Design a binder for this molecule. Structure first.
Ligand SMILES: [Fe+3]
Ligand SMILES: [Fe+3]
Ligand SMILES: [Fe+3]
Ligand SMILES: [Fe+3]
Ligand SMILES: [O-]
Ligand SMILES: [O-]
Ligand SMILES: [O-]
Ligand SMILES: [O-]
Lengths: 202, 238, 238, 202, 238, 202, 238, 202
């Protein structure tokens, strides 16, 4: 049996090396980005945005963020999805983004995910899986984003209920806002300190 | 074969989040312990990337950004296999790399090191592993470079790499180094890894029979991802 | 490929028939040497057992005799590969196991040890290896138990096993033990085996990455049977 | 190259663990036993019976016995049989039995086997291969059962002639008897001592 | 003999309060250093428990909760001596133990592990050491069990124990393990102890000459408490 | 010379294994509990209660707590007490309790202790010694409880004055309250963080 | 303290009955294995011998048969302790010894060796161990002697001894040898003992500080008998 | 823990060194012998005699034999006897003898023992414990002598029933004979071979 290759920080240029187009390095014709909505994609369009803060409250501007999620019906566009339901064919389910250099805000244009089966017949509340890499972060940090307008589903979520501190559960709930007809979920991530965001070993 | 969950990540085989010798980690590490969860479909699935989308020079850092000439520096091929912990090949995984040029300079205004920029080097590449888990790219050997941790800190030459494979739980970013580089023994970033055997796992080895005469050297570097266990009794995943 | 005979059994790799420290062997061992014969079709053939005949719980000793509840004891999965001496997998071989319950008690009136009976444990299982020679069963870890050889003799925990494979010459019954059990070093039955390396060949190893969280541990145990040689010149078998 | 896994005794409960149905452990729907005759099986039906004795003449009541044999035409129901003759399709060729706890007698209901080719063009006399496991027996003991009414074939058998002591050859010959129309072959096995049965390393 | 204070506890011989690999310790460990004090009568005295209060089966976990039959599992006797660091026996100390049953299940609704409950096993016992510091109890060997630290964490088999002896400063709760259990090498709780020699001090040893034929095995386990120093010059205690 | 046996956490069931009666495991006829007052015990009856909090402010419900104290005249019911004064004969001086599963509150019914001699002729203010064990606590934590109505005696206490931070001394002072004629001392314990309770190496 | 049975005799620590290099054992060893039994009062009791019956010279082989003078040979004192396997002293046990004289000749017509008889040496002694398990006797060092096993066989110098102690199960007869005798390495009788450490257990050691000036040398030799286990639960003996 | 001192043969002169008086070595005033009956000893007097044979049937003339037994009421004259019954005070319970040099016969004058408790409430049939030492015997051989006139008690004896070969049980039964009013039990011991006497590891 082999040991997993050891993780190392993405380093100071992880958000440039994995999103070259945006750093003006035009090496690739097709580039990966933070927009998961293609024209025929199904579901309600939402914008997910926020900032990532260090231990003193300073937003990180060198962070690289990726999200992984299910489609509108809660099916993953992955061969490992065993639900036997057909997935939306115009949905990748993944995206990558960095923080704006001036502001420090990151964002994704996506679709609100449908509920996905949990273990042993349970149902998980809608969620998006999120990972953060940056200079100073030795191993990618995993977290999940849940939605404040799904309070009923959130109260029965297996993973949220896994957390004994009711007070830490709230750090995983994004806030819904309506900017000119567009739906936006604000999710700030605090890596360390007061209201530190819950991170998982998955 | 019905697949169950990925084997647990062995935290003793990785660096800890808080590593005081790597100063930037002090304010960017959680004070609370990670919360371990039992896996669900969310953790065992991942996206698929189609070969159609890749250009012919995506894995050739020597030519993919060459404008008026070739980049300056040591021509090297790096190849190897990506497999999971149980030794199974990892097929069609997306491998992305990024690195400095021969002077140790990254192609971005942020980097103001005096090492010279190369107008013909970009420093980003990608490829999909094949059915045998094999990958191969060509590049210019990156030069080591200074950074401010302690005032005179220097990174050994390294190529950053990232893998997206079959399950989200396998997601991994790391960096590999080159056999014999003396800076490997002094790097605070490499030393965040607790054991010597795991530090050695990030060193790419000279592969002399695979050098291409009058052309390029070659380094061999294999990568191991977490593996899935098979289920033969109750399937609790769903 | 035309098959010839099975390689000769290496008697130095097995216990001798007469082993005075295992008292019952004294009156149950032949005084004459075994007569070795050259093999014929009788020795190189064996029966075939169809998968249809097996029930779904035949390899699940935890549930195959469970009446009002689950048996008491340590939940463990045991898996591994059966191959021949030349390293070829042994396909569709019948593997049968039997064992005591967690108290070290066998489910039979003959056994009058005070260790308690478990109404929900039977202690027998079977399965066929697959095309890769793989097998897997689930059970309760058996407890060690006393027996009368010297008055205070104790068997280490063990699971008895039996194999019927491709040739009658491969027929084998033996017993495997669990890594670290201290009774392994004092057992007169295990000590009938002459060499230390062969005694180690009966110890199943903890397989930690294959434990199933909040459920069962796992032990890995491979088995090696005699192998057939291929014939390229005269075929004397017939 | 690997070494064969070392043998160990079947132990005191080998005849219970390998024949659970008979020890009243009803774990399996289909159970293996000592009856090799199915209704359409071809050949003459015979009963094979006997006792197994230790070195002091005491019959063993904890013994487990299996037999392996060819069908009526001397063909084995095994993919390794290379005679190119079709085997009787209603014949397994194998069976397993223990000794009766009170009496100490073991038995099998089977068919008298036909002659099977020996090495280099020879012909072996009809025989059944038999193996014995028990507490105190460290490695299964192999022997063969030949028939006293096949004296002509027995005199030319390659294996029997391999034994230099004419006197030991006889220990492998079972005696034919006729119990009310049924044909019975009595074969007692003496593990040690006077008239010790010949055992083979096959 | 006029007694003075207990020798200082050697903090290097114990686990530290903050031990990041045992996740629950992260939020349950003081950030300030312990304040060391010079001892007074409060620290050198402790309560006395009378033998009259104990029942005859208090140290027999096999029978003290047996209703319709015996508990299922391996019958074992555990015995040894409790002495202080200067080698003096500790007389009439209260030794209390608690443990899981053979399946690794504790008798409480909180524990929802699938390992089966045993209606005839309670899992608590107690006794007073004698004039020689000797103690002995009988029980069923506990089975290992899973817990959520990292997702697939498993405790080796263990029996929890507690001592109240002559001085409040001696108060100690700990856990002992069984010789050869392979989980001992991977446990994050046992690894909070800094040195290998101290980790070995919690392993009970097979005591083969003390096994009781056709009945029970036996493990030997000695315990060492802090000891008092004698005063020959000024007695500052009071 | 021997090394002290190394401490290990009491683990998740320490409050069930050491107080079986309360977890409904009726193995013992005589059970130890949190009531130190017998009918003829001397002194003023008091109730000591509080909660134990982790680093995020969550009360622990799996904690096991014991107290050790002197009688009304400041004499310990221990053979090691060398004051030569007779101790109250209807007083054990020790008790054990867990936290209520719902509320998280623990309590003891006891007597307010009298002053006990300190080292070199000093006098200690009245105090109760307290130890805490729980899952996550590797070594029992020792602290003391002093009383806010003994301010004069507290100001001259050797141990309290051993602590240089006047601000930490206060964490060891319980607050007196009068619930319907009963005297109650509230003592909350904060294992980590703001107003962290002082713990001692004794 | 309620006593239970004697610990099982460890057959690996003793010679086997059949030992072909000691020719006389060939026809005087059972072919059947010994039948082990659980002990009863018959095996745990033994006779008592009163001190009154012993004469003052019973343990002085130098003077107990001296007629006209002293026996010829090396004056030696032999002393030591008899204890059980758990280290407890064996009190009031009957220790009997017998030996050849200085020439290697036994005082009996059967012995026709040419080594000369000594009219002042008898060669038999006895004593009871004291409360500390101590014994002491004085004698003449025996000389080695020839015997017919192979034609030129020679026994090292030795003193035969016999013990009757507290339980019939402790009954033991053996022989001890003297430090440095070179014949010890070639004796087929001593070599019937399987392990080197047990062979060393029969060698009496020179005890130089205990020599008596201008008088006698001294050898120290301790003896270990089987020990009884204490019972704390069911007493099945009766 | 210590290992038992290893046994060694008594050697060729064991019957002379342990019975010096009889070999005419008059070193002791009080000598141990084969007569267990003192004048006031209670019970029926019996003579126990026999020969010890090697593997070829030759009686041994260099053998040393000791017996250990209970008194007439089945009580042992040993401090380890826990029956709480008073033992006959004129009974040692032990004796030692050698074989006559010419004849090869050994004998003891003793009393027929009463039944002694067996384990867990059982009752053992009357028996005498016997041990044999000699040149060629590496470890003293233990056996027991039972009586043919106690068939009823013998059939329920725990130890005799421990032996599975009914045929070996008989080797432990001595035969009663009446030589001129004297009762004699003949017990021959066969160390090896046909009708080998059962020996025990006690
Ligand atoms: Fe870099
Ligand atoms: Fe077994
Ligand atoms: Fe526990
Ligand atoms: Fe001698
Ligand atoms: O970097
Ligand atoms: O067995
Ligand atoms: O626990
Ligand atoms: O001798």
């Amino acid at each position: 049996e082999l040991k997993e290759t050891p993780s190392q920080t993405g380093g100071p240029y992880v958000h440039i090396g994995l999103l070259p187009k945006q750093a003006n390095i035009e090496v690739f014709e097709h580039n990966l980005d933070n927009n998961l909505v293609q024209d025929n994609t199904q579901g309600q369009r939402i914008r997910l945005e926020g900032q990532v803060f260090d231990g003193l409250g300073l937003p990180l501007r060198d962070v690289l963020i990726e999200i992984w999620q299910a489609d509108t019906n809660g099916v993953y566009p992955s061969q490992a999805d065993t639900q036997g339901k057909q997935v939306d064919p115009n949905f990748l389910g993944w995206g990558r983004t960095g923080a704006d250099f001036g502001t420090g805000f990151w964002s994704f244009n996506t679709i609100k995910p449908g509920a996905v089966p949990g273990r042993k017949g349970s149902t998980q509340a809608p969620h998006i899986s999120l990972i953060i890499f940056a200079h100073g972060i030795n191993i990618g940090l995993h977290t999940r984003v849940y939605f404040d307008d799904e309070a009923e589903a959130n109260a029965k979520d297996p993973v949220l209920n896994s957390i004994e501190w009711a007070t830490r559960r709230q750090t995983l709930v994004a806030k819904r806002e309506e900017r000119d007809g567009e739906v936006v979920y604000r999710f700030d991530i605090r890596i360390q300190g007061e209201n530190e965001t819950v991170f998982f070993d998955i | 074969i019905i697949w169950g969950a990925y084997a647990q990540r062995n935290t003793e085989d990785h660096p800890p989040a808080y590593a005081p010798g790597y100063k930037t980690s002090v304010l960017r590490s959680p004070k609370n312990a990670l919360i371990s969860i039992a896996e669900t479909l969310s953790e065992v699935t991942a996206p698929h990337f189609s070969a159609d989308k890749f250009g012919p020079k995506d894995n050739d850092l020597i030519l993919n950004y060459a404008k008026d000439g070739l980049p300056i520096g040591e021509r090297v091929i790096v190849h190897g296999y990506v497999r999971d912990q149980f030794g199974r090949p990892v097929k069609n995984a997306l491998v992305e790399v990024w690195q400095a040029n021969a002077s140790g300079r990254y192609r971005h205004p942020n980097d103001q090191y005096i090492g010279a920029m190369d107008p013909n080097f970009g420093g980003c590449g990608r490829m999909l592993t094949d059915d045998n888990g094999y990958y191969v790219f060509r590049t210019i050997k990156p030069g080591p470079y200074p950074w401010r941790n302690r005032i005179n800190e220097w990174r050994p030459a390294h190529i950053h790499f990232s893998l997206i494979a079959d399950g989200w739980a396998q997601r991994l970013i790391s960096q590999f180094y080159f056999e014999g580089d003396t800076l490997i023994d002094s790097c605070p970033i490499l030393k965040t890894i607790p054991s010597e055997q795991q530090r050695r796992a990030l060193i790419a080895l000279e592969d002399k029979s695979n050098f291409i005469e009058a052309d390029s050297r070659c380094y061999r570097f294999d990568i191991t991802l977490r593996g899935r266990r098979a289920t033969y009794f109750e399937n609790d995943l769903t």
